[PDB]
Amino acid sequence: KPNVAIIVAALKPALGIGYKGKMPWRLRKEIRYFKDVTTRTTKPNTRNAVIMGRKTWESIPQKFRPLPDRLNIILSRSYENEIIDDNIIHASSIESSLNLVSDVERVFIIGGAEIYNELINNSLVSHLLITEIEHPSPESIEMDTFLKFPLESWTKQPKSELQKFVGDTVLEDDIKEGDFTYNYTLWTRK
Numbered sequence: 001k002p003n004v005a006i007i008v009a010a011l012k013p014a015l016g017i018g019y020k021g022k023m024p025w026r027l028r029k030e031i032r033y034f035k036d037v038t039t040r041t042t043k044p045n046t047r048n049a050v051i052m053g054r055k056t057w058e059s060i061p062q063k064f065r066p067l068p069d070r071l072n073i074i075l076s077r078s079y080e081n082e083i084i085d086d087n088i089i090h091a092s093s094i095e096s097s098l099n100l101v102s103d104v105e106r107v108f109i110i111g112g113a114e115i116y117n118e119l120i121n122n123s124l125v126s127h128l129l130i131t132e133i134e135h136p137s138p139e140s141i142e143m144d145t146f147l148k149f150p151l152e153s154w155t156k157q158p159k160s161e162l163q164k165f166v167g168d169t170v171l172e173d174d175i176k177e178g179d180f181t182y183n184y185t186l187w188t189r190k
C-alpha cells in the first residue's frame, strides 16, 4: 500500500479552514504549493491520487475539475466503489478506493472538514502537510469550520525532512500575503 498523507492549510491557533463552504483566504503561493506537491512523482509512469469529500468536489470550479495530472477520488456514503473515467473514482471509503487504483505513488487527502476530522485518526494516514497560517488578529476572521486534530500524538518534522518529501520544490520561510503569514510543515505519528 502506497503512503497516504493529509494536505491542509489552517489558521492558528484554532486551526480554522473555512467559512460557509469557502476558504477565508486567497493565498496565491500556497495554491501553487498545493498543486506542485500533490502532482509531482519520483518514479516514472506513475501519478498521485487526491481523495476528497463530495461537498469539496462540488465547490471546485468546473474548469479545474477534475484536478489535472492527478487521480481524483471523490468520497460519498452513497457511492458504489467504481471507476467513472481515467481521472475520476467514486468510493465509500479510502481503503475501498486504494483497491481500485493502479500505478499510484502518493495519496493526498485534500478535504473537506468532515473528511479531515474523520481520517486524521485513520492508521492509513502517516503524514500531515499542514500550512500553518498566522494573523495579527485570528478572531477577527470569520470562521465556522475547524480541524479536530490531535497534534499531541503527532510530531513536527524538520524542514529538511519536508524538503526531502517535496523534492526540488521551493520552501520559503514566513510567506507574507496581506496580513497573513504562513509556513509549510510536515508531521508524523508518535
Ligand SMILES: NC(=O)C1=CN([C@@H]2O[C@H](COP(=O)(O)OP(=O)(O)OC[C@H]3O[C@@H](n4cnc5c(N)ncnc54)[C@H](OP(=O)(O)O)[C@@H]3O)[C@@H](O)[C@H]2O)C=CC1
Pocket (backbone or CB within 6 Å): 007, 008, 009, 010, 017, 018, 019, 020, 021, 022, 023, 024, 052, 053, 054, 055, 056, 057, 075, 076, 077, 078, 091, 092, 093, 094, 110, 111, 112, 113, 114, 115, 116, 118, 145
Ligand atoms: N483550508 C483548506 O486546506 C481547505 C478547506 N476546506 C474547507 O472545508 C469546508 C467543506 O468541508 P465539508 O462541508 O465537511 O465538506 P467535505 O468535503 O468534507 O464533504 C463531506 C462529505 O463527504 C462524504 N463523507 C464524509 N465522511 C465520509 C466517510 N467517512 N466515508 C465516505 N464518505 C464520507 C459525505 O458525502 P455524502 O453526504 O454524499 O455521503 C459528506 O457529505 C469548506 O468550508 C472549505 O473552506 C476544504 C478543503 C481544503
Ligand SMILES: COc1cc(-c2ccc(C)cc2)cc([C@@H](C)C#Cc2c(C)nc(N)nc2N)c1
Pocket (backbone or CB within 6 Å): 007, 008, 009, 030, 031, 032, 034, 035, 052, 056, 059, 060, 061, 064, 109, 110, 111, 131
Ligand atoms: C474552492 O475551490 C477549490 C479550488 C482548488 C484549487 C483549484 C486549482 C488550483 C491550481 C489550486 C487549488 C482547491 C480546492 C480544495 C480541494 C483545496 C485545497 C488545499 C489547498 C488550497 N492548500 C492546502 N495546503 N491544502 C488543501 N487541501 C478548492
